[PDB]
């Protein structure tokens, strides 16, 4: 945090928190989404908006937990001094830091775009193509953020334990979101 050398790895932590805040804000907007649910004569199998609402939050919660876990795993390496958390060796860590940082903005954008895709779905503009495509991008981008943490960090670390599970949840939730999107689409095969 407040280190006397502004180590590049710590610089990344700040960026990860910034990304987290951005994701959690989208997650917040996700909770502000009112589904097409009214006490009227609408007995259909179309609770799509709700099935998306839950899963959007499942991603939102998992994604935010993931980026915070990345920061955690990274920070563990910083505290121990096993990553390159020294400006004099920043040539090595800086490329890991920027790699993690860029990947985080990748997951941030992907997960944010999914928020926009879900935003349409909940409100009535059901776009299975947009939703599924973005979900696969979310899962791929976000789960790859774990791959970046697999670099430098050890997998059996508890910070990584939480990290791995959170990233897995993104893929799992995105799958479910895809599955649910398929329900609101007519693909007779």
How was this model experimentally determined?
Answer: NMR
Distance CA 134, CA 168 (A): 17
List CB contacts of 44: < 8 A, sequence separation 6 or more: none
Q: Is 86 helix (H, G, I), strand (E, B) or coil?
A: coil
Counting runs of H as helices and runs of E as strands, what totals does the chain give? 5, 0
Distance CA 82, CA 55 (A): 37
> What distance, in Å, lies between the first and last C-alpha atoms of the chain?
55
164, two tokens:
């791995």
23, two tokens:
């994701």
**Closest C-alpha among 103, 101, 109 to residue 26:** 109
Buried/exposed 158-168: b ≥16 CB within 10 Å, e otherwise: ebbebbbebbe
Could you confirm whether domain 1-189 is CATH 3.30.70.20? no
User: Count of residues for the chain?
Assistant: 189
């Amino acid at each position: 945090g407040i280190d006397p050398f502004t180590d590049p790895t710590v610089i990344a932590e700040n960026e990860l928190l910034g990304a987290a805040a951005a994701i959690e804000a989208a997650a917040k907007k996700l909770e502000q989404l009112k589904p097409r649910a009214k006490p009227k004569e609408a007995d259909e199998s179309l609770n799509f908006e709700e099935q998306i609402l839950e899963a959007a939050k499942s991603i939102a919660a998992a994604t935010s937990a993931l980026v915070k876990a990345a920061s955690a795993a990274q920070r563990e390496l910083v505290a121990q001094g096993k990553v390159g958390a020294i400006p004099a060796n920043a040539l090595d860590d800086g490329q890991w830091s920027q790699g993690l940082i860029s990947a985080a903005r990748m997951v941030a954008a992907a997960t944010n775009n999914l928020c926009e895709a879900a935003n349409a779905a909940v409100q009535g503009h059901a776009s299975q193509e947009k939703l599924i495509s973005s979900a696969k991008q979310v899962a791929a981008s976000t789960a790859q953020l774990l791959v970046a943490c697999k670099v430098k960090a050890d997998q059996d670390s508890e910070a990584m334990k939480r990290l791995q599970a959170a990233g897995n949840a993104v893929k799992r939730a995105s799958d479910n979101l895809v599955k649910a999107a398929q329900k609101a689409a007519a693909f007779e095969d």
